[PDB]
Design an enzyme around this catalytic site. Sequence first.
Site, PDB file in Angstrom:
ATOM      1  N   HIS A  41       0.791  -1.217   0.000  1.00 43.46           N
ATOM      2  CA  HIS A  41       0.000   0.000   0.000  1.00 43.46           C
ATOM      3  C   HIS A  41       0.842   1.297   0.000  1.00 43.46           C
ATOM      4  O   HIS A  41       0.472   2.295   0.600  1.00 43.46           O
ATOM      5  CB  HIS A  41      -1.023  -0.046   1.153  1.00 43.46           C
ATOM      6  N   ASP A  89       0.519  -6.575   3.104  1.00 42.65           N
ATOM      7  CA  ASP A  89       1.073  -5.251   2.925  1.00 42.65           C
ATOM      8  C   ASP A  89       2.613  -5.351   2.782  1.00 42.65           C
ATOM      9  O   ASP A  89       3.356  -5.167   3.750  1.00 42.65           O
ATOM     10  CB  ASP A  89       0.657  -4.363   4.117  1.00 42.65           C
ATOM     11  N   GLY A 183       3.284   7.494   7.647  1.00 48.29           N
ATOM     12  CA  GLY A 183       4.595   8.069   7.402  1.00 48.29           C
ATOM     13  C   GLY A 183       5.755   7.205   7.881  1.00 48.29           C
ATOM     14  O   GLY A 183       6.883   7.299   7.356  1.00 48.29           O
ATOM     15  N   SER A 185       4.904   4.164   7.688  1.00 50.43           N
ATOM     16  CA  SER A 185       4.394   3.006   6.970  1.00 50.43           C
ATOM     17  C   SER A 185       5.430   2.397   6.060  1.00 50.43           C
ATOM     18  O   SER A 185       6.140   3.119   5.403  1.00 50.43           O
ATOM     19  CB  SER A 185       3.163   3.417   6.174  1.00 50.43           C
ATOM     20  N   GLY A 186       5.603   1.089   6.131  1.00 51.55           N
ATOM     21  CA  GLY A 186       6.590   0.419   5.314  1.00 51.55           C
ATOM     22  C   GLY A 186       7.958   0.338   5.984  1.00 51.55           C
ATOM     23  O   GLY A 186       8.783  -0.508   5.630  1.00 51.55           O
TER      24      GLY A 186
HETATM   25  N1  LIG Z   1      -0.323   2.438  14.461  1.00 52.83           N
HETATM   26  C1  LIG Z   1       0.586   2.274  13.497  1.00 52.83           C
HETATM   27  N2  LIG Z   1       1.734   1.568  13.672  1.00 52.83           N
HETATM   28  C2  LIG Z   1       0.251   2.892  12.181  1.00 52.83           C
HETATM   29  C3  LIG Z   1       0.963   2.488  11.044  1.00 52.83           C
HETATM   30  C4  LIG Z   1       0.583   2.935   9.786  1.00 52.83           C
HETATM   31  C5  LIG Z   1      -0.488   3.857   9.691  1.00 52.83           C
HETATM   32  C6  LIG Z   1      -1.209   4.348  10.818  1.00 52.83           C
HETATM   33  N3  LIG Z   1      -2.135   5.443  10.681  1.00 52.83           N
HETATM   34  N4  LIG Z   1      -1.907   6.725  11.034  1.00 52.83           N
HETATM   35  C7  LIG Z   1      -2.976   7.518  10.853  1.00 52.83           C
HETATM   36  C8  LIG Z   1      -3.015   8.980  11.271  1.00 52.83           C
HETATM   37  F1  LIG Z   1      -3.004   9.638  10.211  1.00 52.83           F
HETATM   38  F2  LIG Z   1      -4.064   9.290  11.928  1.00 52.83           F
HETATM   39  F3  LIG Z   1      -2.003   9.437  11.912  1.00 52.83           F
HETATM   40  C9  LIG Z   1      -4.016   6.681  10.316  1.00 52.83           C
HETATM   41  C10 LIG Z   1      -3.414   5.391  10.226  1.00 52.83           C
HETATM   42  C11 LIG Z   1      -3.995   4.296   9.672  1.00 52.83           C
HETATM   43  O1  LIG Z   1      -3.270   3.382   9.297  1.00 52.83           O
HETATM   44  N5  LIG Z   1      -5.269   4.192   9.581  1.00 52.83           N
HETATM   45  C12 LIG Z   1      -5.795   2.929   9.288  1.00 52.83           C
HETATM   46  C13 LIG Z   1      -5.423   2.223   8.110  1.00 52.83           C
HETATM   47  C14 LIG Z   1      -6.089   1.042   7.739  1.00 52.83           C
HETATM   48  C15 LIG Z   1      -7.118   0.549   8.582  1.00 52.83           C
HETATM   49  N6  LIG Z   1      -7.462  -0.730   8.425  1.00 52.83           N
HETATM   50  C16 LIG Z   1      -7.493  -1.529   9.494  1.00 52.83           C
HETATM   51  N7  LIG Z   1      -7.675  -2.809   9.097  1.00 52.83           N
HETATM   52  C17 LIG Z   1      -7.810  -2.880   7.756  1.00 52.83           C
HETATM   53  C18 LIG Z   1      -8.151  -3.942   6.896  1.00 52.83           C
HETATM   54  C19 LIG Z   1      -8.305  -3.638   5.552  1.00 52.83           C
HETATM   55  C20 LIG Z   1      -8.078  -2.299   5.086  1.00 52.83           C
HETATM   56  C21 LIG Z   1      -7.723  -1.203   5.929  1.00 52.83           C
HETATM   57  C22 LIG Z   1      -7.621  -1.474   7.287  1.00 52.83           C
HETATM   58  C23 LIG Z   1      -7.498   1.251   9.763  1.00 52.83           C
HETATM   59  C24 LIG Z   1      -6.809   2.449  10.115  1.00 52.83           C
HETATM   60  F4  LIG Z   1      -7.065   3.171  11.172  1.00 52.83           F
HETATM   61  C25 LIG Z   1      -0.830   3.795  12.079  1.00 52.83           C
END
Ligand SMILES: N=C(N)c1cccc(-n2nc(C(F)(F)F)cc2C(=O)Nc2ccc(-n3cnc4ccccc43)cc2F)c1
Lengths: 235, 97
Positions: A41, A89, A183, A185-186
């Site tokens: 992603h 991912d 940010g 991420s990855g």
């Molecule tokens: N906590 C971490 N280590 C981390 C790592 C990467 C991204 C985020 N941030 N930062 C933010 C910030 F901007 F707010 F800072 C938002 C996120 C984030 O990843 N939102 C997000 C992404 C995807 C899904 N999701 C959950 N299960 C899934 C299953 C399928 C598809 C999506 C799926 C739910 C979510 F909350 C957090």
Amino acid sequence: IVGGENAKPGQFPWQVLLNGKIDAFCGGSIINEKWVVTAAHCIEPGVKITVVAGEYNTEETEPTEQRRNVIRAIPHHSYNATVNKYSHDIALLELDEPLTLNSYVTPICIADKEYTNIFLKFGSGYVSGWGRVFNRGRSATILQYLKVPLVDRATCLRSTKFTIYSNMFCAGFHEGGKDSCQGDSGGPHVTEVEGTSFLTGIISWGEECAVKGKYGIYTKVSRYVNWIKEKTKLT
Amino acid sequence: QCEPNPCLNGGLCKDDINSYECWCQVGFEGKNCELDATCNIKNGRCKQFCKTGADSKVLCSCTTGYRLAPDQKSCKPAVPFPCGRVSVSHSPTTLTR
Ligand SMILES: N=C(N)c1cccc(-n2nc(C(F)(F)F)cc2C(=O)Nc2ccc(-n3cnc4ccccc43)cc2F)c1
């Protein structure tokens, strides 16, 4: 990385920073001088990405930096079929011109199926990256790192809305307050056995960042490892 | 202590005043290098990867980039800049104090 400490220069030499439409957008882990690797992603239709190797303070210009541009960008033979796009991912970016390997450009180690899990199940790993410094707000200019205890399947299921399958694993703090982030991420999640650090995760997603009660979740490289092994074989 | 060698299977007896041990070798485990080593008894005494094999005897080895030394346990870098080591804080002969 929110809740981390500043990393120090030359100490994280696998920490590619993935540059594209927005600047500081995903991290990456030098699977080796000719290919770096990252969460799938971060592969957008249209963007043309640029691995920034030896980077330390983004707000300033380090002599170790070695950018390449991604000559092509595989993701796994099962990324998303329009379905749940954060499972496997994972992905490789072939760099175009091979990176000059040095003490700031150094690949992380990719241990086979059976052993990557073992390192993974020692239960604390060094997560790193330039991502958000706080929960929505401020991104890390000078590389951030953080240690993460492994947090169990049963409990982390208990903090979700979403489906946490097996190609991922959960980790972070029970008492909320420090995690990776957007940010980051990855970026890497590696465990060192006595010097030699090995990769055991791609930092993936998370219902928000570092939110008391919810954790951040990571890819299970154990699975894709052999695959990685295959497709980067310079030999 | 070492008349004849209490460590067998090739191991080596650093005898002492009171006591003595058996610097054991590969393949082999237990006190007087008696019983076999096993991929679950202390990683196999291999420094990276323990495997078994045809027999039940072991087989140490290394990631792409390292080379299993002639002692057959510890791993030596086999290319200049080896995978996943920090190299600022060790060159030429330094430790992170
Ligand atoms: N906590 C971490 N280590 C981390 C790592 C990467 C991204 C985020 N941030 N930062 C933010 C910030 F901007 F707010 F800072 C938002 C996120 C984030 O990843 N939102 C997000 C992404 C995807 C899904 N999701 C959950 N299960 C899934 C299953 C399928 C598809 C999506 C799926 C739910 C979510 F909350 C957090």
